[PDB]
Amino acid sequence: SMVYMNIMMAFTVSLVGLLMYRSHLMSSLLCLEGMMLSLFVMAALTILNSHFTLASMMPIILLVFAACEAALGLSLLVMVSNTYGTDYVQNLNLLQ
Amino acid sequence: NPIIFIIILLTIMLGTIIVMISSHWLLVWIGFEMNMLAIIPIMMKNHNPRATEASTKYFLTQSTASMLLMMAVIINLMFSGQWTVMKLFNPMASMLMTMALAMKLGMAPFHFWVPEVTQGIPLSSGLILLTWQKLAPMSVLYQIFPSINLNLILTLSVLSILIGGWGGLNQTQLRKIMAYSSIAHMGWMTAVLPYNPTMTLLNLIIYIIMTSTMFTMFMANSTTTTLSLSHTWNKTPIMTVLILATLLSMGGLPPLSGFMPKWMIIQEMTKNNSIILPTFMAITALLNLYFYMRLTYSTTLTMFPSTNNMKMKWQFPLMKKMTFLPTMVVLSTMMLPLTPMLSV
Amino acid sequence: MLKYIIPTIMLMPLTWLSKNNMIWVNSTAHSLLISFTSLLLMNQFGDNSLNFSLLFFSDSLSTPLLILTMWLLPLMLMASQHHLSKENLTRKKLFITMLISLQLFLIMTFTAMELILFYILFEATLVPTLIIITRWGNQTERLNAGLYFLFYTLAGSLPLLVALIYIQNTVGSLNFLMLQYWVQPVHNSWSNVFMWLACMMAFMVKMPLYGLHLWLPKAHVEAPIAGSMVLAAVLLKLGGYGMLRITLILNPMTDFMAYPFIMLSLWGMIMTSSICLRQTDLKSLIAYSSVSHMALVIVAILIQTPWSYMGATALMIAHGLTSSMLFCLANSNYERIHSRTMILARGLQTLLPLMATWWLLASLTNLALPPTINLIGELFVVMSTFSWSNITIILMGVNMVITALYSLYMLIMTQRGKYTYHINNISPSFTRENALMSLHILPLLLLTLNPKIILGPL
Amino acid sequence: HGSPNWLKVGLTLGTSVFLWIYLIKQHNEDVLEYKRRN
Amino acid sequence: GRATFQFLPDEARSLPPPKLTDPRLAFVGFLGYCSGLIDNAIRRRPVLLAGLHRQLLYITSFVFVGYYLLKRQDYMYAVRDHDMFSYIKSHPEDFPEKDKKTYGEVFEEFHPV
Amino acid sequence: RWIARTFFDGPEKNYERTMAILQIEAEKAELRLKELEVRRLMRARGDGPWFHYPTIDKELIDHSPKATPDN
Amino acid sequence: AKTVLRQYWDIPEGTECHRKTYATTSIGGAAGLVVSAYSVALKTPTSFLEGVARTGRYTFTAAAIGAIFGLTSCISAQVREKPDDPLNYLIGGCAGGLILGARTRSYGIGAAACAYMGLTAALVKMGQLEGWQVFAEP
Amino acid sequence: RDHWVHVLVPMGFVFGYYLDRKNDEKLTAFRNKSLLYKRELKPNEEVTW
Amino acid sequence: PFFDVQKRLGVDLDRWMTIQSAEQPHKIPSRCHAFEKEWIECAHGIGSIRAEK
Structure with missing residues (x-):
């Protein structure tokens, strides 16, 4: 119903201009963990009314990697501030 | 450090098996999730501040390219609820599928994943390990194959060699010259994939061999093209x-x-009354050769071995499985009447 | 070829297997012995036809052309030894092996039994030639000329594969030229232009038109040790003959668009020989003679109906022997004066009397003095394109005029004197210098007795 | 004198004789397995 | 095409087998014969007739593997034509019988120069 | 006289060799029109197992009286 | 989309010279908005305004080719002998290319814009004239 | 020594001529032709195969 | 490529959580259980290219 349009409008918390930009890179890793619960909820609304009885273990497992994923990504974001003190995505040295 | 370096390295290929051994979209999500978890240490080993500022440019490019895939699963969860790996039953899903997965294999859009990582990682040693990540999603496009829009998979592939070609004539750093022409050899195989999706794997098995034997040759000292001069008269002619x-x-x-794929792959591209499509690409990989000529004009013509330094000692690296690579990567063109009946 | 390729590959583990300086005498000894065996089973009869063994040979039945391909490895080793003998034996063993490796693919070429066996062997060259161009030259403009030799030959030859694979799955299979009995004709369309044009244009890039000849005075000007692949590159140019295999059949009825290939190559003929009389580099003087009366065959193939194939075959091996020797006349007389500038070599004809005959009997074959293999070739082309239109005697006649004034201009520059300089130039044209200058005119005037061996089907 | 390692020198000479005899017995069987089936 | 995930299935018994002294099996390993000579040439041997025990077991490798590889190559064409001829055998409406007409029927172009 | 029978043959070998390796071709160049008749154009049937795409396996279905009277 | 071509390739065919060049400036006008523009715009960040204009400014420069690109054809389609031909539609190549020749001055660009555009001009209508199909299936 | 480098290598001719004969002994399809080319009654067109 | 190890040796790595009507631990079906079992009955030996039409 309208309970899916909101929330499919709320999947646009990626929006890629604000998925790596601008600086204070913690603001970009924020919406990477906040892009979940637009997948954790959008799955949970579908498994639950339509009684699948078995696929509802999948929303439990959906958090378990994305927590461990983002925790890894947060380890490296200390290493960019361990060498500097500021994350500041307009750091660029290795060109392309 | 030594034993745990295997267990990290062992699970990289264990991540990609579950991608292939699966009848269920949840397991192919886990499959190259943990590859993006177990590559990040191999980027690091000597802890140099380009490498830390390179894997983090590697990282989030393969976090979103992960994340759109799970979006593509949950759309056709709503439509008919089958989770076998097959056609995706929705053109709004398959469109979001193919150009999500085009970042991990990086095509011509989703551009600078390929040069900006591979350049300047102080581990130039290998980084042959970037052949698994070209091998996992190709094992996903073998099944999804009869559900695509046929325009997007070509437009990412017609742009592939036209822009992977031009990109590297302006280079010296031979890691970038290996990073370039790695989009080009992803251009020949996915231009064919809608038409007879085997005789795609022929191009891939050739591409693993010829690229793996290129890096092993490079592991004496070689960094830059000017360093590729000073080993003819010094190391070994x-x-x-x-x-x-x-x-x-x-x-x-x-x-x-290396003429073995094309010769066979045009046997499939025409026979399907498509002639203006190969004639563009076959003439496009011609200035993919002006990398290699003008690279061979460095080492094979004695171009200035100066700064007299003698290597009066022998060499002891490990050139593993090297004696059998340029004997199946050069001399096989007569001996393959059917490699495409073993692999088929 | 039953086994001509099988002995000539056995030449290759003989060179490195040998001792020290014996490597010159061991290779030239056995390489002459094939010339009996090359003649031996071939030149048989003869009336429709000699299919030879299998999918590997149609025996080069009506176009022999292949005995001349086998003289050369025992002709170039005696020529190349002039300034090569300062390098290592490990590279002197290389330069003999890739030269044999060039003769291997030419032997399965010209016979080839097919059209797709032809192409992969038509392109199996250009790798061992390019190694002789880039390494082993002189000072620079090797490297761009190493790239002009590519990218004309390779840009054109890739639309062969688009068309030859297109035929293989359209009408049966091309695998035999004798399954070419069923041939549908090719009418006037907008796709059948390109089928004709892409199949033809890759042959034009080797035997040049007036356009796209821009690579031909690049590789021949800057050139190896003593014409050592330049003798090979003149055979390889006339080894793009396969238009005789294709266009006789396989779109037979398209003369409708021959005209931009006629007029470009018939007016270009009268100009590209005229543009050479002011040359100052001696090896570039010959390099434009090779443009002009090679391009007479291009108006001799596209005009069909023999009394031209009588002559168009005889012209492929007319200057196969002539233009080879002229390069050998210039690969000599450069060992003594270290410039190829034609101004500098004056004061001659007194110092080296025995080679005065070698200048003239070379340049008397372009004047061509009718009982040779030359004016039995041109006078069939002349009497052929007369019957196309009468007006073509004018341009082709002025072709005969200017090349008379052209060939003598290279002779008469040596008939002067007083020499002004030159404490060097002592060597009185030694026994090798006349031996490899012989075996050119000795078969060239010999075959004029019974030249029925040099004829097409026809 | 000669000084190899004397350990693996012969393993290469012992693997082939293992491989060839396994090959030829697999070949001399399968040469009869055609007629045993056809 | 059935009986999935085999290297070569059970039903390949009635194929010849591809017995030896075929020139491919001579050629497979001839490149290995070339490869072992390279194996010395990389390392500043400086022999080019070095230790034969390294120069052997390359010959043993390619020939054994290449033989055991070719048993499915001849299978896969044999299973290719086996399924085509059956679909030729059924559906005669997709496979008509053409008429035999000699050169008394055709009036071709006729284009002389 | 002693050149022909000492070296080579006449019109009994190189004639009817062209009858022999032109009957290896008429069974080659006629099948390549029938691959492209069947392979390229199977088409809308998918009958022979070349274009055969998997769907689902109905062996793993259940037939137990599952506890809902109106499923 | 493809239906723009289904109103381009369908109705006019040489005649009706206003709706021909009204629709054939839509496609070439739309490609000025394209990725080229995207790229440069992003690359220079432009400014608060004026910058934006300048960026687009050149997109506006680009517009104009498809305005004449029917017009050079549909005039010369009917006035000569009344088919549409490969030599008919060849004429729209050169002077159609010379818009890029007129701006960003010639003598090294403009004739090269004239020459190569005339090559790719006639082949398009030649394509359906032989029934050419680029992205096909068996 | 006995110089296998020398004339033993042109002895590959008959070695190559051995393989030259093995094709025509399996290219034995037609004794049935009509242009002399007969194999009618005689032991002439049978021999040299 | 799809190796399909789990068809050779008879373990189910997953295969059970795939479709809407497979096991049901205490036999409580879905809302469209009647149409899953009916539709999978249609295309079994059919090669799915003729099943679409």
């Missing part, structure tokens, strides 16, 4: 003759065996 043979083979010249 037989190395200069070998490094000529593979490049001239990888350009696609018919006395060698």
